[PDB]
C-alpha cells in the first residue's frame, strides 16, 4: 500500500469525488442551457448545434446509400442497402482508405480531393458510378448547419488542420473537389456528426435510444431535444437531435479548477491550443500522452527508476492510450507494463510497474468519471423533458477507447448510474459504426430532397429573367402599336382606347362636381369642390355604398337604378339636393368613346357581369336610370376610366404626371399620347390620354410563352374565360387564386397538409389581397404565419407555412415584375416618341394590392428602372382616389362645352 | 311612459349589458397581449406602441420649454417654465391658432408649413426666438418611434387626412417646414401622444397616476407597462408608458357582433373607412352624427315628428355632439332639444323632445360603458403587475366630450368602478390638457439629448473622412520613400528595414528546420520538415512556452537563457536532441539587418523591455545563451520578422502573395520592394522583401493631426511613450486601453455607471482583444453585452452596455480604417513599381485582433478598396503561423550558407 498510497496523494487533483462530479454536472447543465438560448449562445463554449434529424429510424427507410466517415481513427467509405419490403434488412459493405498525416494537416484542397478520389475508387470497384446513389456524409467535427445538407466547419479538432476549410461549407468543398475530377456524380444529401450517426444506428435496433456518445479519438454526445427548447430553430413542434459538442466545455476557463499542470502542458503541445479542453482530459488521443507527462514529472522527481530518464520517455506520443490499456489488463496488467516501460529505455522494476499502472488508473478513471458527469447531465435533461420521476433510455456508443479499454466501460457505467439514481440506462455498443445510421438519415434526407426538387422545378416556371422580361416589354410595345394603328386596331388585344382628355390640369378648374367611382373594391359617390387662382383648394367628401352580389350580377336596369339610388341618397347626405350639377363618372371598364360624355361598355371585366349593359353607352344607362326616378337631374359631363382619373388626380401636383397606373382588383395603365399616333381619332394636333386596357394583353396568346398550368386553370374558372390574361397574372382579384391552385396541386402531390385537401382550400377567395400582404410581411415569425393561416381554416404546420409563404412570394414577385415590363414599355415608348435620350416622368398610382403589398411596389419599381434605364420614373401614390382627377376632367368638360 | 319604454327596445342593440362589457373587456385584455408580443404584434389592431417615457414627473423637472399640441379640438401652442431650485412653481402661458379644414385635409406641405408659421408667430410674440428653446410635440395620432425624438405617422385619424404625411417622420417634416421659412431655429427634442401628455400632466400632481385617458374628438388610453412585458424593447429593467391606441380596437372584425347598422353607416361615410372602429363608436366626433342617423331612421318610420323629415335632418353632421350634451341637461335639456330640433325644421312637439333626449342617453351611455370595458382591462393588467390583491391608482383624463357632457363622467366612472370593483381609482381630470405633462417630458428628453450630443461631439473625433484617409495614405507613402532613401533614412520614422529575403518560395525548399516564434501572444518553438519534388509535403509540430512576467521585463541574458532552455526541452519533446540543425528565428521586433543571419535590435516594442538587448545582434544574444548551456548546438541560419514570415508562409501556396500584414498584439507590414529602390542595400537587381515597421508611423508628428486626447493618455502611460504611435491606434494591445480611457472619461462626466469609477475600470488590460471582439459581435442581446461587462467586473446597465458597445465600435472602426490606409499606400506603390493600371495582389495576414474581431477585416478590406480603386487586394489568412514561412526562409538561408 506504501507505493500506491504515495501516488494517490501525488495525483490527488486527478481524482474526482461524487461531490465534485455533481458540481461538474450542474455546470454542463448550465452550459447546455446557454448553448441553446438565443441570447447567450454566441458565448457558450458548448454549442448545442441543431442537426435537423427529427427522430431515430421509423423502419420505413429503404434504398441504396453511400456513406462517408471522416474524422474518426480511420477514413471509411460504405454502401448501405436497406430493404424491408424484400426480406432484406440491413446490408452494408465498407472499405477503409488511408489518409496520411500530411493530408490531414495540409491544405483543405488536398483533403477533399483525396476524399473525392477515394469515393471514385470506391464507386469504380462496385461499378456503380452510373447509379444515382444518395450520399451521406459523416463529418465528425462541429458544424453550422441551417439545413441537413450544409456543413459549415466551425473549427478543426483532434488530428485535423486543413488550410481553407474552417468557415466553409464542406458539402461544397467536396462537391467542388468532385467536379474537378469529372469521373462521377455525387448527390451529397446530408452531413451528420458521428454521435448523431451512432445514435441513429443504435436507435435502429432500440426504439428507446435518445443519445449518441463517442469516446474515441475525441469525445462528444448528441441527444434528442424538444424543439420548444431549441431557440436557434424556428419552431415548437416535435423534436430534433442536438449535437452538444462538449469537448469545448471549459474552454472559457470554466473548468480551470479541474484542469491540472498536466492538462495545461498537454495543451501547449496540442494542435489547437486553448480549445477542446474537456476533450483533452477525456478522449483517447490524449489519455496516453497525458500519462507520459505524469510519468516524466515523477521520474525526474525520483519517484521512478532511481530517477533515470531516456529520450524515448521525453519523446512526444511514446505512450499511447493503447499502452495505457494493456497496463490495465489484470492478467497482463503489470506484466505488460514491463514490456512497455522496458522499450522506453528506463529500467522498470516491479515496484515501478505497479506505480505506473496506478497512474494510468487514476487518469483513465478521470476521463471515465468526467464523461459520466456530463452524460448524467444530459440524462437528467432528457428526464426533465418528460416530467416523470424515472427515466428509461438507451445510449448508442462508439470510440476506439471505449471499445478496447478493459475498465473504462465498466467504471463509466457504475459512476454514471450512481449519479443519476432515478433512471435505467442501456449502453448499446455500435459494432458496425455510425454507417448504418448515416444511411438512415440519408434516407429521410433524400426523401425530402426529392420533394424540394419537384417544388422548385415547378415554381421555377414563375422565374422571369432579365431577358424574358425585356421580351415582354418588347411585345407590350408591339401590342401598343397595333392598338393605335387603325389598320390593326380591330384585331388588337390592347385596345389603346382614347379617353378624350387632351391635357393635364392647368390650374383653372373651378366649381363643384358630383363624382361617381365604380369598378374598384368600393363603389362610392363623391362631392368635390375646387378653387383656382391666388389660393388653390380642393375640398371633398364621399360615401361608400355596398353593391349587393345579386345586383352586381343582376341586370343593367337594376344596377344603374341602384346607382342613381345611391346618387340620390348622397345628395341628401350632402344637403345639395336641388340644383342640376355636373357629374364625373368613373367607370373602371374598357369603354369605346366618341366624346368625353359618351362611352360604350366594350366588355365586362373583374367581378362584374350585369346583363344588357355591354354594347351600351354607360352614360345612357345612367341618364336612363335617373329618368326612371325623377327625384333629381344632373349633367354627366364625363365618363372616365380610373387609370386616367388617377393620373389626373396626381398630375394635379406633379405636372410631369403623364402616366396613370392601377394595381388593385384589376390592373391597367393610361398615359399621354401624341394625337398623330392615335390613328383611331381624327387630328394630329396636341396630345390625348389613352386608356390602354392592358389587362387584355396576351388575350391573343402573345404570353402563352410564360403562362403556367396554374394561370390557365385560374383563367378557365374565371367569369371572363380567356380574357384579361395579363391582368389575371397581376391583380389581387387573381393572384390569391393563382397560389391557391398551386397549393392544391402541391397538396395532392403530398407536399402540404399531409395530402389532405382542406374543404376550405377548395374555396376561392381565400387568399385575398389583404391576407396575401400579411403573409409576405417581412421579418414575420413562423408562428405568426401559421397563425394567419389557421384563421383561414388551414390546419398547417411551420414547414407548411414556410411553403405557403415561399409560394406567395413567387407569385407576387412575378406579378410585380410583369407589371414592371408593362410600365417599362410605356415610358420607353414615350421617351422615343419625344425623341429624348433620357426621360423624366412621374406615374400616379392606386389600387389596394399595390397599397398593401410588402414587396410589390418595390419589386416592380426596381424592374422598371432595370428595363428602361434611359427612363427615370417616379411613383406618386394617390391617397384621395379618382374623385379629384375625375372632377378635374369634368371641369375641363363643362368648360370646353361653353367655350 | 310608453313613449320612452319603446325606444329603449328599438335601440336595444345599443344597450350593452354587464354580461357583455365583461366579454369586451376580456377580449381587449387579449388584444393588449397581442400588441406587446413581438410575434403577433404585426397582426394586432391594438398596436400598443412604446412611448419612450419611463415614469411620471418626480419634481426634478426644470427648464423653459415650448409645447405643441396638434390633432386635438384645437391646435395649441404653450410655454412651460419650472425650477424648484430657484423656487419657481410651474408657470405656463398658452395660446390657440385657427386651422381651416382645407389645411387639415390638404397636403403635409401646407400643414407643417402652417404649424411652423404658428410657432413662428408664437415665438415672435414673446420674443423668445433667440433663446434656444427645447420644443416638445403632442400628436395626437398613432406613431412609430425608435427614438422618441422621432415620430412615424402610422395613420391619420379623426378629422385629419393629409397627403404625404403617412409612414413618414412628422419630426423631420416639421423641421423642414421651419427650415424653408428660415424665420427661426426650433429644435424638437421629443414627440408624445396626447394620452401620454395627459397622464404626465396628472402624474405630476398625483403619483399612482399610471394611466392616461382621452375622450374628445377621438378616444384613446396609455398606461405604465412592465418592460419585461414589452417584447419590442430591448430591456427588462423598470417600466415604460405604452400607448395602447385602442381606437383601432376591433378593426379586424373582432367587434363585428357589437357594431350596429348605425356604426357601419357612419363608417361608410367617415374619413377612414374600416378603421378606428371602436373609436367611431365612442368619440365626440361621432356621437352627434351617430344620433342624427338614428333620428333619420325613426323619422322615416314615422316614429319622430309625425314622420316628417326635412333636408336639414338628412344633411351630414347637422347634429353636433354639442347638442348631444346640451339636450341631456337636467333642467334645460328638453328646452334645448326644442330649439335645436326646431332649427332642424321638423315641427318639434313636447313629445318628440322627450323621445330624442332619450336616444342620446342610449348612445352616450354606450360610449362611456365601452371606455369602461377597455380601461377595465388596463386596470386589471396593472393589478396583475403590482401583484397586490387590490389596485390603488389614479387615472389622468381629458377630452371635450368627457369634459363638457353632464351625464358622461358620472355614468362612466360608475360603470367602471363596477366592472372592476377590485380597485380604488381616482379620476384626476387634467386642467392644462397636456402642455404641462408634455413639457414635463421635453425636459427629460432634453436632458438626455444634451448628454448624447456631448458624447457624439467627443466620439466624432474618431471619425475620419474619405479625404482624411487618403491624406493618411499619402503621408504613409511619403514616409515609405523616406525610409528607402539612404539620404533621409537615418531620420525616417518608417524604417523600411531589409529582411534579406529576395523572393517567395520557389518549390526547391527541402529539409528539416527548427523554428522560433517570439514576440506575439505566444512564444513557441517549432519543427518544420519540408519535402520538395513532384510530391511536396509540410509536416510541422510546436509547443507553446510561457515567458514569465519577470523574464519578459528582466534581463537580456535571462530572456535568451529561458529561450535556449525551452529550445532544449523541445528538442527533447520531439526527441531530436543531438544533431546540429538550422534554426529560423522569428523575432517580431524592429531589427537592423546586414545579412540574413545578423539582426541588431533597434528598439523594444509592445510588451517587452529586456535589458541589455537594444544595440545587440539578437542572433548573437542567442548563440551566447547556447554556448552557455553547452547542451546542444544550432546553426541559426536567419532572423525573421513575423510580417515577413507570414508572407512566406502564405506565399508557399499562393505565389501571387507579396505582402505581409500582422494586426495582432502590435501592427506592422512587409512587401516585396524593388532592389533598385532599397537605397540601403548595395545592388539593384531583383527584389527584396522590406520589413516596413509601420508602427512608428506618426512618431515624428505626422499623425498628431488625427490623434486624440485618449490616444495621448494611452501612449503616455505606455512602456514606450511617443513610439509606435500609429500601431497604438490599431493593435489589440492598445485599442482596449483607448476604450478604457474613453469610458473612464464618460464616467467622470456622469454618462456611465452613475458617475462612479469602478476600481475595475482603472485596471489596465481590462478590455482584451478577446473581449472587444465579443462586445462588437453582430445581432447580440444587450442582456448578453451587459453580461460580458459584469464579467470583467463592470456592473453595467442596459443603457451603459449600449454606450460601451458604441464606443468599442468607434475605436475598432477607426483602427480598421487607419490600417486600410496603411495598406492602400503599400499596394498602390507595388502597382507603380510594376507600372500597371490595375494590380492584383494578395496579402498574408495573421494576428488575434484580425482573426477574432468581427468587423476589423471587413472595414479594413472595404477601406483598401476605396482608397486604392486601381488595386484588387485579397487577404489570405495564415492558419499555420510564421513557422512555415520562416522555415522556407531558413531553407534558402542554408542554400546560401552551404554556398
Ligand atoms: O475511431 P475513433 O475516433 O477512436 O472512434 C470514433 C469513431 O468510431 C467509429 C465510427 O464509425 C466513427 O463515426 C466514430 O467517429
Ligand atoms: O380598390 P382597388 O380596385 O384595389 O383599386 C382601384 C381603385 O382605387 C381607388 C380609386 O378611387 C378607384 O377609381 C380605383 O378603381
Ligand atoms: O380636444 P379633444 O380632441 O376633444 O380632446 C383631446 C385633447 O385634450 C386636450 C389636450 O390638450 C390634447 O392633447 C388632446 O388631444
Ligand atoms: O498573437 P498576435 O501578436 O496577435 O499575432 C501575431 C502572431 O501571429 C502568429 C505568428 O506565427 C506570429 O509570428 C505573430 O507574431
Ligand atoms: O470523434 C468524436 C467527436 O470528436 C470531437 O472532437 C468533435 O468535436 C465531435 O464533432 C466528434 O463527435
Ligand atoms: O380598375 C382598374 C382597371 O381594371 C381593369 O380590369 C379595367 O378593365 C380597367 O378599366 C381599369 O383601368
Ligand atoms: O387624441 C385622442 C386619441 O385619438 C385617436 O384617434 C388617436 O389615434 C390617439 O393617438 C389619440 O390618443
Ligand atoms: O507583432 C507584429 C509587429 O509588431 C511590431 O511592434 C514589431 O516591431 C514588428 O516587428 C512586428 O511585425
Ligand atoms: Na424552437
Ligand atoms: Na389622330
Ligand atoms: Na422589454
Ligand atoms: Na540598393
PDB file of C-alpha atoms in Angstrom, chain A residues 695-849:
ATOM      1  CA  UNK A 695     -55.265  43.645 -68.920  1.00  0.00           C
ATOM      2  CA  UNK A 696     -56.218  42.051 -72.228  1.00  0.00           C
ATOM      3  CA  UNK A 697     -52.512  41.879 -73.030  1.00  0.00           C
ATOM      4  CA  UNK A 698     -51.878  38.288 -74.064  1.00  0.00           C
ATOM      5  CA  UNK A 699     -55.517  37.575 -74.895  1.00  0.00           C
ATOM      6  CA  UNK A 700     -54.134  36.516 -78.284  1.00  0.00           C
ATOM      7  CA  UNK A 701     -51.527  34.177 -76.835  1.00  0.00           C
ATOM      8  CA  UNK A 702     -48.544  36.529 -77.090  1.00  0.00           C
ATOM      9  CA  UNK A 703     -47.958  35.464 -73.465  1.00  0.00           C
ATOM     10  CA  UNK A 704     -48.743  31.745 -73.695  1.00  0.00           C
ATOM     11  CA  UNK A 705     -44.986  31.618 -73.561  1.00  0.00           C
ATOM     12  CA  UNK A 706     -44.726  32.366 -69.837  1.00  0.00           C
ATOM     13  CA  UNK A 707     -48.198  31.210 -68.742  1.00  0.00           C
ATOM     14  CA  UNK A 708     -48.488  28.219 -66.413  1.00  0.00           C
ATOM     15  CA  UNK A 709     -50.831  25.296 -65.753  1.00  0.00           C
ATOM     16  CA  UNK A 710     -51.938  27.370 -62.806  1.00  0.00           C
ATOM     17  CA  UNK A 711     -52.585  30.579 -64.695  1.00  0.00           C
ATOM     18  CA  UNK A 712     -54.610  28.588 -67.179  1.00  0.00           C
ATOM     19  CA  UNK A 713     -56.734  26.962 -64.512  1.00  0.00           C
ATOM     20  CA  UNK A 714     -57.410  30.325 -62.902  1.00  0.00           C
ATOM     21  CA  UNK A 715     -58.263  31.842 -66.270  1.00  0.00           C
ATOM     22  CA  UNK A 716     -60.528  28.915 -67.080  1.00  0.00           C
ATOM     23  CA  UNK A 717     -62.626  29.103 -63.941  1.00  0.00           C
ATOM     24  CA  UNK A 718     -62.963  32.867 -64.260  1.00  0.00           C
ATOM     25  CA  UNK A 719     -66.077  34.744 -65.356  1.00  0.00           C
ATOM     26  CA  UNK A 720     -64.199  36.083 -68.369  1.00  0.00           C
ATOM     27  CA  UNK A 721     -62.540  32.878 -69.563  1.00  0.00           C
ATOM     28  CA  UNK A 722     -59.646  33.661 -71.927  1.00  0.00           C
ATOM     29  CA  UNK A 723     -59.759  37.432 -71.383  1.00  0.00           C
ATOM     30  CA  UNK A 724     -57.559  39.859 -69.391  1.00  0.00           C
ATOM     31  CA  UNK A 725     -54.784  37.247 -69.317  1.00  0.00           C
ATOM     32  CA  UNK A 726     -52.138  39.750 -68.286  1.00  0.00           C
ATOM     33  CA  UNK A 727     -54.293  41.218 -65.536  1.00  0.00           C
ATOM     34  CA  UNK A 728     -55.010  37.763 -64.120  1.00  0.00           C
ATOM     35  CA  UNK A 729     -51.268  37.421 -63.514  1.00  0.00           C
ATOM     36  CA  UNK A 730     -51.075  40.691 -61.547  1.00  0.00           C
ATOM     37  CA  UNK A 731     -54.185  41.990 -59.752  1.00  0.00           C
ATOM     38  CA  UNK A 732     -55.398  40.978 -56.299  1.00  0.00           C
ATOM     39  CA  UNK A 733     -58.645  39.569 -57.556  1.00  0.00           C
ATOM     40  CA  UNK A 734     -56.477  36.835 -59.084  1.00  0.00           C
ATOM     41  CA  UNK A 735     -53.058  36.396 -57.512  1.00  0.00           C
ATOM     42  CA  UNK A 736     -54.555  34.714 -54.461  1.00  0.00           C
ATOM     43  CA  UNK A 737     -56.233  32.194 -56.739  1.00  0.00           C
ATOM     44  CA  UNK A 738     -53.042  31.507 -58.652  1.00  0.00           C
ATOM     45  CA  UNK A 739     -51.494  30.491 -55.333  1.00  0.00           C
ATOM     46  CA  UNK A 740     -54.493  28.555 -54.126  1.00  0.00           C
ATOM     47  CA  UNK A 741     -54.284  26.361 -57.212  1.00  0.00           C
ATOM     48  CA  UNK A 742     -50.570  25.766 -56.743  1.00  0.00           C
ATOM     49  CA  UNK A 743     -51.182  24.705 -53.153  1.00  0.00           C
ATOM     50  CA  UNK A 744     -53.997  22.340 -54.117  1.00  0.00           C
ATOM     51  CA  UNK A 745     -51.571  20.742 -56.552  1.00  0.00           C
ATOM     52  CA  UNK A 746     -48.665  20.687 -54.096  1.00  0.00           C
ATOM     53  CA  UNK A 747     -51.157  19.065 -51.728  1.00  0.00           C
ATOM     54  CA  UNK A 748     -52.205  16.052 -53.804  1.00  0.00           C
ATOM     55  CA  UNK A 749     -48.521  15.752 -54.649  1.00  0.00           C
ATOM     56  CA  UNK A 750     -48.179  15.128 -50.909  1.00  0.00           C
ATOM     57  CA  UNK A 751     -46.245  18.295 -50.030  1.00  0.00           C
ATOM     58  CA  UNK A 752     -48.793  20.051 -47.807  1.00  0.00           C
ATOM     59  CA  UNK A 753     -51.272  19.213 -45.083  1.00  0.00           C
ATOM     60  CA  UNK A 754     -50.384  15.552 -45.139  1.00  0.00           C
ATOM     61  CA  UNK A 755     -52.175  15.236 -48.505  1.00  0.00           C
ATOM     62  CA  UNK A 756     -55.487  16.477 -47.133  1.00  0.00           C
ATOM     63  CA  UNK A 757     -57.223  18.979 -49.408  1.00  0.00           C
ATOM     64  CA  UNK A 758     -58.991  21.125 -46.870  1.00  0.00           C
ATOM     65  CA  UNK A 759     -62.594  21.816 -47.701  1.00  0.00           C
ATOM     66  CA  UNK A 760     -61.548  25.396 -47.143  1.00  0.00           C
ATOM     67  CA  UNK A 761     -58.595  25.205 -49.536  1.00  0.00           C
ATOM     68  CA  UNK A 762     -61.216  24.305 -52.134  1.00  0.00           C
ATOM     69  CA  UNK A 763     -62.725  27.746 -51.509  1.00  0.00           C
ATOM     70  CA  UNK A 764     -61.977  30.556 -53.945  1.00  0.00           C
ATOM     71  CA  UNK A 765     -61.343  33.986 -52.415  1.00  0.00           C
ATOM     72  CA  UNK A 766     -59.339  32.582 -49.514  1.00  0.00           C
ATOM     73  CA  UNK A 767     -56.133  34.387 -50.375  1.00  0.00           C
ATOM     74  CA  UNK A 768     -57.376  37.948 -50.685  1.00  0.00           C
ATOM     75  CA  UNK A 769     -55.079  40.906 -51.181  1.00  0.00           C
ATOM     76  CA  UNK A 770     -55.374  41.813 -47.516  1.00  0.00           C
ATOM     77  CA  UNK A 771     -54.244  38.390 -46.282  1.00  0.00           C
ATOM     78  CA  UNK A 772     -51.713  37.873 -49.065  1.00  0.00           C
ATOM     79  CA  UNK A 773     -49.900  41.040 -47.879  1.00  0.00           C
ATOM     80  CA  UNK A 774     -49.786  39.973 -44.231  1.00  0.00           C
ATOM     81  CA  UNK A 775     -48.050  36.680 -45.030  1.00  0.00           C
ATOM     82  CA  UNK A 776     -45.155  38.090 -47.037  1.00  0.00           C
ATOM     83  CA  UNK A 777     -44.722  40.876 -44.499  1.00  0.00           C
ATOM     84  CA  UNK A 778     -41.002  40.990 -43.694  1.00  0.00           C
ATOM     85  CA  UNK A 779     -39.357  39.637 -40.541  1.00  0.00           C
ATOM     86  CA  UNK A 780     -42.560  37.841 -39.596  1.00  0.00           C
ATOM     87  CA  UNK A 781     -42.426  34.747 -37.387  1.00  0.00           C
ATOM     88  CA  UNK A 782     -43.365  31.200 -38.399  1.00  0.00           C
ATOM     89  CA  UNK A 783     -45.856  31.070 -35.568  1.00  0.00           C
ATOM     90  CA  UNK A 784     -47.324  34.322 -36.880  1.00  0.00           C
ATOM     91  CA  UNK A 785     -47.517  32.941 -40.425  1.00  0.00           C
ATOM     92  CA  UNK A 786     -49.034  29.684 -39.202  1.00  0.00           C
ATOM     93  CA  UNK A 787     -51.482  31.835 -37.272  1.00  0.00           C
ATOM     94  CA  UNK A 788     -52.720  33.900 -40.200  1.00  0.00           C
ATOM     95  CA  UNK A 789     -53.306  30.579 -41.991  1.00  0.00           C
ATOM     96  CA  UNK A 790     -55.094  28.927 -39.099  1.00  0.00           C
ATOM     97  CA  UNK A 791     -57.517  31.866 -39.175  1.00  0.00           C
ATOM     98  CA  UNK A 792     -58.380  30.999 -42.767  1.00  0.00           C
ATOM     99  CA  UNK A 793     -59.258  27.443 -41.843  1.00  0.00           C
ATOM    100  CA  UNK A 794     -55.941  25.902 -42.824  1.00  0.00           C
ATOM    101  CA  UNK A 795     -54.543  23.384 -40.342  1.00  0.00           C
ATOM    102  CA  UNK A 796     -50.900  23.917 -41.268  1.00  0.00           C
ATOM    103  CA  UNK A 797     -47.571  23.427 -39.512  1.00  0.00           C
ATOM    104  CA  UNK A 798     -44.442  25.560 -39.693  1.00  0.00           C
ATOM    105  CA  UNK A 799     -42.943  23.558 -42.543  1.00  0.00           C
ATOM    106  CA  UNK A 800     -46.281  24.064 -44.271  1.00  0.00           C
ATOM    107  CA  UNK A 801     -46.239  27.790 -43.516  1.00  0.00           C
ATOM    108  CA  UNK A 802     -42.738  28.040 -44.989  1.00  0.00           C
ATOM    109  CA  UNK A 803     -44.004  26.625 -48.259  1.00  0.00           C
ATOM    110  CA  UNK A 804     -47.141  28.786 -48.483  1.00  0.00           C
ATOM    111  CA  UNK A 805     -45.010  31.824 -47.796  1.00  0.00           C
ATOM    112  CA  UNK A 806     -42.495  30.741 -50.403  1.00  0.00           C
ATOM    113  CA  UNK A 807     -45.332  30.267 -52.888  1.00  0.00           C
ATOM    114  CA  UNK A 808     -46.999  33.620 -52.252  1.00  0.00           C
ATOM    115  CA  UNK A 809     -43.586  35.178 -52.630  1.00  0.00           C
ATOM    116  CA  UNK A 810     -43.025  33.701 -56.056  1.00  0.00           C
ATOM    117  CA  UNK A 811     -46.473  34.586 -57.351  1.00  0.00           C
ATOM    118  CA  UNK A 812     -46.466  38.159 -56.067  1.00  0.00           C
ATOM    119  CA  UNK A 813     -42.924  38.660 -57.363  1.00  0.00           C
ATOM    120  CA  UNK A 814     -43.656  37.561 -60.915  1.00  0.00           C
ATOM    121  CA  UNK A 815     -46.644  39.869 -60.671  1.00  0.00           C
ATOM    122  CA  UNK A 816     -44.668  42.951 -59.693  1.00  0.00           C
ATOM    123  CA  UNK A 817     -42.143  42.016 -62.400  1.00  0.00           C
ATOM    124  CA  UNK A 818     -44.620  41.510 -65.237  1.00  0.00           C
ATOM    125  CA  UNK A 819     -46.321  44.727 -64.240  1.00  0.00           C
ATOM    126  CA  UNK A 820     -42.917  46.358 -64.498  1.00  0.00           C
ATOM    127  CA  UNK A 821     -42.206  45.225 -68.035  1.00  0.00           C
ATOM    128  CA  UNK A 822     -45.543  46.835 -68.852  1.00  0.00           C
ATOM    129  CA  UNK A 823     -44.844  50.268 -67.408  1.00  0.00           C
ATOM    130  CA  UNK A 824     -41.344  49.909 -68.858  1.00  0.00           C
ATOM    131  CA  UNK A 825     -42.617  49.596 -72.409  1.00  0.00           C
ATOM    132  CA  UNK A 826     -44.932  52.567 -71.880  1.00  0.00           C
ATOM    133  CA  UNK A 827     -42.428  55.107 -70.585  1.00  0.00           C
ATOM    134  CA  UNK A 828     -39.773  53.945 -73.036  1.00  0.00           C
ATOM    135  CA  UNK A 829     -42.181  54.478 -75.927  1.00  0.00           C
ATOM    136  CA  UNK A 830     -42.946  57.972 -74.684  1.00  0.00           C
ATOM    137  CA  UNK A 831     -39.224  58.712 -74.451  1.00  0.00           C
ATOM    138  CA  UNK A 832     -38.669  57.516 -78.024  1.00  0.00           C
ATOM    139  CA  UNK A 833     -41.818  59.240 -79.287  1.00  0.00           C
ATOM    140  CA  UNK A 834     -40.441  62.526 -77.992  1.00  0.00           C
ATOM    141  CA  UNK A 835     -37.001  61.572 -79.307  1.00  0.00           C
ATOM    142  CA  UNK A 836     -35.288  62.186 -75.974  1.00  0.00           C
ATOM    143  CA  UNK A 837     -32.282  60.109 -74.884  1.00  0.00           C
ATOM    144  CA  UNK A 838     -33.499  60.231 -71.291  1.00  0.00           C
ATOM    145  CA  UNK A 839     -36.931  60.972 -69.841  1.00  0.00           C
ATOM    146  CA  UNK A 840     -38.236  62.241 -66.518  1.00  0.00           C
ATOM    147  CA  UNK A 841     -41.855  61.252 -65.958  1.00  0.00           C
ATOM    148  CA  UNK A 842     -43.879  60.611 -62.823  1.00  0.00           C
ATOM    149  CA  UNK A 843     -46.583  57.922 -62.626  1.00  0.00           C
ATOM    150  CA  UNK A 844     -49.702  58.298 -60.463  1.00  0.00           C
ATOM    151  CA  UNK A 845     -50.669  55.026 -58.773  1.00  0.00           C
ATOM    152  CA  UNK A 846     -53.632  53.476 -56.976  1.00  0.00           C
ATOM    153  CA  UNK A 847     -55.031  50.060 -56.126  1.00  0.00           C
ATOM    154  CA  UNK A 848     -55.102  48.057 -52.920  1.00  0.00           C
ATOM    155  CA  UNK A 849     -52.743  45.257 -53.971  1.00  0.00           C
TER     156      UNK A 849
END
